[PDB]
Amino acid sequence: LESLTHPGSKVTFPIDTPQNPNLKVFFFDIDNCLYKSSTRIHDLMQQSILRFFQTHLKLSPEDAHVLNNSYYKEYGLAIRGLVMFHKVNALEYNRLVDDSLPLQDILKPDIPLRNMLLRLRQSGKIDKLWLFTNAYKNHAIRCLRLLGIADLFDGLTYCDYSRTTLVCKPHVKAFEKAMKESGLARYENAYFIDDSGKNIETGIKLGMKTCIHLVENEVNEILGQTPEGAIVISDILELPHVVSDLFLE
């Protein structure tokens, strides 16, 4: 990644103190949000995860599918279950999974996306664009850099796989962490986009101003139906359509 030279190829916000309490923050999911689910990256991840269940838990493929979906469904991350019940080391799992995707051959600079996010930053209606992902920081950063958007965000809340289980979406504590890290004072000053219906559900219940459910094709049942109060779009470039006012001075 260090040989990338395109705009947005370098992270410009710190990773890892009172603030203006009127801060407005737009939280961005990453996987299947900042890139399309139709990249099939999610399918690549799942293949790798299923391989891990087989090689490390010694499960047949069908038992692997079932347990993976069960953990994913209850926790928002299979790895949460693997840590708690199977005493798996999440960083080693992560090394084999997310961190071994052929992303460099899949993700390329998304110029329309870059330009859309720039307009959102430049309206003055939103104070911070804050990343909020269940991925570990390695993968999250890699996605931003390849997509050419690593300079367009003010911070990153990611799931800390160092824990031995993980605080993650859709659990409330993950949202409380994003609020604290981003400097957000009230959920009312927050907006949120994510492809997972369950994640959006939590954002809505907590009192976030506007939550957008991003469903490129059909809903993944495991991730949840579109919840009540949510706005649905099929591509992140449709944000200008549904929260137009945030793009206007």
Ligand SMILES: [Mg+2]
């Ligand atoms: Mg996502």
